[PDB]
Amino acid sequence: SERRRLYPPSAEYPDLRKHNNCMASHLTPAVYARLCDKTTPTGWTLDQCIQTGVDNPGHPFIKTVGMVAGDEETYEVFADLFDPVIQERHNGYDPRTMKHTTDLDASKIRSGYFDERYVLSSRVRTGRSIRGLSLPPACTRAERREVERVVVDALSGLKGDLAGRYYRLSEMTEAEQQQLIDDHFLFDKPVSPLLTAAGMARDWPDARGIWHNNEKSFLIWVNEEDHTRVISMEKGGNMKRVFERFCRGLKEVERLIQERGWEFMWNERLGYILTCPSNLGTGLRAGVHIKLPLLSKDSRFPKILENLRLQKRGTGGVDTAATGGVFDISNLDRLGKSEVELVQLVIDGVNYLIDCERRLERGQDIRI
Amino acid sequence: SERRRLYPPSAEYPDLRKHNNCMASHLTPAVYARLCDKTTPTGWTLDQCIQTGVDNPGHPFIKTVGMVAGDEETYEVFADLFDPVIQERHNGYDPRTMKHTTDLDASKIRSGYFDERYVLSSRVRTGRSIRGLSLPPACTRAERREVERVVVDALSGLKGDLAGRYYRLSEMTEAEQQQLIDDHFLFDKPVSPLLTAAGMARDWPDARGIWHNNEKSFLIWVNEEDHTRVISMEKGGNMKRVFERFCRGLKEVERLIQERGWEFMWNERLGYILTCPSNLGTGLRAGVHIKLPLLSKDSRFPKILENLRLQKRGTGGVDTAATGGVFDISNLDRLGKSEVELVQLVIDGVNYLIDCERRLERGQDIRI
Amino acid sequence: SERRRLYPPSAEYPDLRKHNNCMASHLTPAVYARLCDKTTPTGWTLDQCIQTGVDNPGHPFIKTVGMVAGDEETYEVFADLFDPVIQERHNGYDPRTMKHTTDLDASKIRSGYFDERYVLSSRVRTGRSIRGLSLPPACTRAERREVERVVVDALSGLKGDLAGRYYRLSEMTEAEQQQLIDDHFLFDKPVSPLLTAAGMARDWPDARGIWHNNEKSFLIWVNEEDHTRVISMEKGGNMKRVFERFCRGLKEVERLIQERGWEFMWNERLGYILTCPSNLGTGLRAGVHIKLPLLSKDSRFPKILENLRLQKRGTGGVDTAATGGVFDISNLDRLGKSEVELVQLVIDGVNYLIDCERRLERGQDIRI
Amino acid sequence: SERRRLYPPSAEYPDLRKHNNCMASHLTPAVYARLCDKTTPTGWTLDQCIQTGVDNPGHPFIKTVGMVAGDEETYEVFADLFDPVIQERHNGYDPRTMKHTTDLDASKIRSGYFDERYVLSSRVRTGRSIRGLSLPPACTRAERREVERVVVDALSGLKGDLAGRYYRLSEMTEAEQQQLIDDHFLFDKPVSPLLTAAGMARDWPDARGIWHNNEKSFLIWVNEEDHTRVISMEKGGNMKRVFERFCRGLKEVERLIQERGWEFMWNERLGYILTCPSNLGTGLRAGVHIKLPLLSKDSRFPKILENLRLQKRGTGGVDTAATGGVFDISNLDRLGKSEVELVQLVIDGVNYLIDCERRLERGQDIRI
Amino acid sequence: SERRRLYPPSAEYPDLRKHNNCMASHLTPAVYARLCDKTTPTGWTLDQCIQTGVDNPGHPFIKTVGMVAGDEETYEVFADLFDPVIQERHNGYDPRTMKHTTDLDASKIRSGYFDERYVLSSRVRTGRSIRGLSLPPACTRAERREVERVVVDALSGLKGDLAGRYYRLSEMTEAEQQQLIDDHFLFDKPVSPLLTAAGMARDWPDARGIWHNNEKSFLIWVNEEDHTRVISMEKGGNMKRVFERFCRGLKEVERLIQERGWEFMWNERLGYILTCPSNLGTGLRAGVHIKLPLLSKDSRFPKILENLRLQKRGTGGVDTAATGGVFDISNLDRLGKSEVELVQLVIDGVNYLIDCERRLERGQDIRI
Ligand SMILES: Nc1ncnc2c1ncn2[C@@H]1O[C@H](COP(=O)(O)OP(=O)(O)O)[C@@H](O)[C@H]1O
Ligand SMILES: Nc1ncnc2c1ncn2[C@@H]1O[C@H](COP(=O)(O)OP(=O)(O)O)[C@@H](O)[C@H]1O
Ligand SMILES: Nc1ncnc2c1ncn2[C@@H]1O[C@H](COP(=O)(O)OP(=O)(O)O)[C@@H](O)[C@H]1O
Ligand SMILES: Nc1ncnc2c1ncn2[C@@H]1O[C@H](COP(=O)(O)OP(=O)(O)O)[C@@H](O)[C@H]1O
Ligand SMILES: Nc1ncnc2c1ncn2[C@@H]1O[C@H](COP(=O)(O)OP(=O)(O)O)[C@@H](O)[C@H]1O
Ligand SMILES: [Mg+2]
Ligand SMILES: [Mg+2]
Ligand SMILES: [Mg+2]
Ligand SMILES: [Mg+2]
């Protein structure tokens, strides 16, 4: 019988009276009721999007998006809720009106050479999703295996310096995995509630792997937080070389992916599509390791970082806290500016910091 | 087989040759045939809308709408029939073109203090419907229980002077109910054919209740004629205080309803959505008890009331007739003017009447 | 989205903690949950069946079925709930196993002649439903008009003594209707809550009528409580003549109905299908009027009535209470026994009562 | 287009080459392919059933079912996979052929009185699920709130000694919750991967609560691992009194649930339906706290426990490990035997153990 | 269950890394994914369109379309892929913007008379498809038989000089078929992979035939490469007479087709619809046999042919290679220019060639 009544959407509304994520602040009864009945063609629903945020109220003073996407169509189907969140996260970028430009030309960047004072090592990271396949939060076992197959077959075609091997987690010893993790060259099993609540730890470690070059200066994580996570690393300060390797490797990987008929998810409004809305746009997180001595006990570093648009997090991972005054300094925003612009911004900020690490003298200028 | 023929819509057309309600005057074969096949998403149909009017031909010289709505979508689905009725009821207000503005600021109203000559007591009343739940004419048992749960849980959060208790009719003794009714602080079982024909007496008294404050100056009827009926009362003439209490209590109730994820039905064209189209807009019925002595022997009292836009009905209820020359004087129109405007109109009219109760002298001016 | 959840059936379960009808006693959560999804092809649902019982808790010590049927298929679709009720009502008749036999031969009955002591007048009544048309609780305006048309066209073919006229309620003056009602020759507007809650007073008086013979000894009510109510009256005590007229008139009416291609609802298990399950089987209520003197002062009147299988109700209608010690004495059970058997039982019972009216002497024997 | 091909079921088959749960041992490609396309009416699928087992390979030598049910229909829809698992878990009970009998009569049990040597305290526990509502793994927010409403309203009717209060986790301070947990009178947030992977920690702590009597000897957990978890506790050894209180409280709770039209999930083959197949049947876990001295240094304690059909786990919870030689001794099997039989078995086993705690002398007999 | 996942479109993408047809060059992952799910009303799909091109990589330096159409709707449904291919084939004609004009008036053409030096014989050919019937690649047996019936019944009405007989391949001896093929008056069984991979050799020789006039100067192939192939032949050089016969015969055939209610597929953008996109527009291939002596030893013959827009292929068929320096010289483009224009172009080109066959003297001018 069709005379039976469904639960009113307001009956399903989450209790967000003590939540501290952008989803909680931007979710309203009207929006929830409007979107309560829609779904992406693959079956992704709003409740599945906001489950991670609902489960984790979020620590006060710490900003977390609290939502994930199950496929490319999500950002279009549930745009009424994602657009305010994307705008709030990326310092006012408006997906509805503005457009994103991608530029990976490593020739444009200048400077490059650093001073081995507190940089230690430099890293650049991005993420890519294969079009036509569900994202990690929603992907089935078959889709995850398909992503792994596509990526591995493509990377098999890499030649020259960017030639390496793919290691499957299921086939890797626990000691080897721990050693790789400690060396910053591997990812651990998701333990933080954000990923588990999002449903991104299902079937672990089935179809998760790491492809790395012989020099271990070019890595690709397969099915950990996104379909692919491309990392270019260097135990030095020649950020120009790291970014050049990153750009050429990414171009080769994209060419090989397109060879077999696969494409990366990408649209003009949002750029490269990923799971966490915080990673939209370019997904670039060019950064460096930074030490305590000249950076732990100066005057007003947080103001300088905010003015320079630099993020500082705890070494060893986002979940881990800073220890011994050693942090990771990267960029804040992904959507909007381009990869070259973000790398140049990071380089200028770190140059200013090593210039404004005053311990020999004083006169920190901040210089917004 | 699809070759079978349905009854022509004109076969179902009601016999309204001796009817005296706006539905009968505005229902035509073309409109009925046009709307005979449509239905709201919850299954409400035109025949269900007009059943109350069809069953009751209506006493001549007495205007009754003769229709009810089963949900919010009704006024949009069957607008072709409701819009003329709404326009006729509310002295020409056009839902299709005009817009409604709601204003409950008790600061705007002036005067307030009355003279204890015939006012005796003052009262203000409105109605509210919870969005997502069917209206009393169409609500099932589960929906009615859900409305009761939402309202009771919300009112549990009221603090301060507006703190009271919820009494369930099913748990209330017959003597207590009779005492409350005789004291004007309760509602009786619907006996008048208008409500029973509309299907608003089903499952009585299941899920019908009354929440009242300790002073019994603030009451809320749950599931009698609408989802909620909010009443602010005073055994005096300080209409300003009554309206201030009404406004603040309504604001608190709305805030608590929204806190749990529920909203009141409301749209710009019609304002607050209710069952009887006569109550659309604000649903406000600010009024006062009035005695016989000076008003009963008035020269042209009906003319003064009509010019001042004041409705006069029999004390003890709409169904009951005036006895002993004691009536209830309230406002006429709900849609269009705002709550503050209606209260000010009622206050000005009653001030004029107490000024134009001439028995000491003569010279009634009417003063349209 | 199909991921939305419906209200659990137990959420819709009626609150029957203070009900006194067979529906309340025989309705259980399991049965309700089982039957809450089914519906007859015309859309009749269980809640519609039990609404009349739910609305009216029922006076204690008074037995009311509390359910109605919206069409013929109802008794088959909701048999799980009706069968226990039918069995309880008709003193153990089992619809699932037993079968009903119809016999209207007035030749079999003997005696007939009564004594003009307390009988005053005699009456016989049955009801019939036209197959293919919804019953009064569920019939639309078109279906009711179709029933009226079929019955009127058929009755137009009656000849001989059973020749009369059809009077439409909508075309009868109030005084004429009141006079007919007072003369026990007409039906009044349904005012008792049992019929109104069942939805059998909709569109009154549209398509309700009375066809009566010139002698006013053979009447047919059209669309009051069933599609047709056939009555044979006589202001006397010659029950044999009344039953003979009843039988021949019913046979002629059935023949004329079948002539145009219409049939009466009927099946072996239940006999003639009607709205109230109490009227199933034959629907026969052969009875008489009885006075106060020798019966009001009866020694063990209820015991004799129960032993003889006779019902006593208030004169002027079931709703009206007995006044002046004058009652109506009829039979109790309809399903099971046949019409001839029922009339013979009534005749024997009235003969015994008039013989056991002892006021001249004593010695009432009851004689179960 | 319908010419597109779906992923073959074998493409979705989990990689169970290193798994140690009954699901892994009993799941085969044929069964998976057969059940890959079916679903319960509420949308529960096989992958959702086996996700918890797939995610957790299971510690070797530790037996875990590895599956959960999302509703009552699951055990019928996916019986082809659950039946072998149920049979293996409950020492050969065959759901397809055998039948379960429930008996809670506390009069049958004898003995009861214990010796305060190592018992310390006694406890009895069962679980119940409200029919018509999805189980914790699959329940939405609205369904969980409905379960809480039903249980709280029912328990409000408890009188006599079993009269207490309901405390909502969302409204309980962290210190109070920790104190209750430490006192063995509360449940903590699910942290063990078994529940989180099953999706039973969603929306925590929304709609989870604890209703306990004034003496705190009768508790009911609402929405932690099942819809309801009923516990009868005593800081002593009078197991007879504990079981009597348990039985009478459970009977009263069931009566109050049925009063409003709700039923507990229950069928003859499986008994009371719960989430973990290990808890099917009665869900009874009558047990006691046991100390180290005469049991830690036991000669062949595991053999005696296995022969007596007594399970021993770590104090403080199943996840926690035994500390200080203090364990919890309860029964092993739930389906099959009845509640009285299980309680009698536990009492006899503990009596034997306290008799066979030989430290004063030797001669442990095991006595299978 | 609808939770099963389909193969991503990129999984079905053909491997075209070594292909040399316009389909391979113009097919891209985005286009394939966009069109992977669409289909014509008769069930034709993109994979069926491109199967012939996928199977045959294509000889380098030889241009083949690599696609076929299964019905008229194909060119509209899959226009996103056909339009670039049509534009590339027909020297830049844009189907989306430009329009095609058909003109068969044989009066406009001038000259006509040729010199019997290398012409030997002249031929003109076109193709026509009956609307409402699937094209040879997709036609079933019934549709092919219907096409044969329509064409044969129409041609039966031809009178005058264009009067002949229809010969069925199934009823024709192998020796007779070979003799007809050798005389250039018949078609052989499709052996070249292009037609077989396209599915145009199914059920051979069922419903394939040849209708030829008594003089054998007017032939019509039924169901070989298209529904109808109309050929006008002459063993001479009077191209004017051949084209006049062609025009009048085509007009008569079209009139007779329309008489019975059938139409030729035709739309303004593309002209006459046929299977191979290379034949769209007019399908006209006016041409002549050409010998070796003067043309074989030509100085820059390919340049002259390209400048004059004349195609040269091997005698005996497209599959066969040129032998003895004898080729077939026809027009290149079909869509765009009209039939009269194409015939005039061919006549002018052959006149120039016979004038620029210089062996008596030198001075070839090419004269673009
Ligand atoms: N600049 C860096 N240099 C060296 N290692 C790094 C750097 N940034 C991140 N890592 C390594 O990457 C791992 C995970 O980094 P994470 O914070 O998850 O990056 P993201 O936020 O981009 O996912 C950490 O264990 C850390 O050791
Ligand atoms: N101004 C007033 N003062 C005191 N009691 C009132 C007043 N207006 C209404 N009531 C009480 O409310 C009850 C129902 O009022 P009703 O006419 O139904 O109001 P509405 O038309 O807004 O529903 C009556 O029994 C009456 O005693
Ligand atoms: N035996 C009878 N003799 C005369 N009038 C009768 C008799 N039985 C019923 N009536 C008249 O019929 C009217 C309705 O009867 P009712 O109690 O409804 O019968 P039923 O239960 O068969 O419908 C009453 O007003 C009454 O006057
Ligand atoms: N016999 C007992 N005596 C006292 N507390 C107990 C006993 N059994 C269990 N508990 C308490 O119950 C809590 C959870 O028990 P748990 O192992 O989850 O039981 P179950 O397996 O029935 O859920 C523990 O924190 C523990 O303190
Ligand atoms: N100009 C011509 N003169 C004589 N015969 C021809 C001529 N053109 C084609 N043919 C004959 O037609 C047959 C098939 O021609 P084909 O190359 O398939 O034409 P199309 O490309 O139009 O289908 C060949 O066997 C050939 O003998
Ligand atoms: Mg990370
Ligand atoms: Mg009212
Ligand atoms: Mg009656
Ligand atoms: Mg537990």
Ligand SMILES: [Mg+2]
């Ligand atoms: Mg050819």
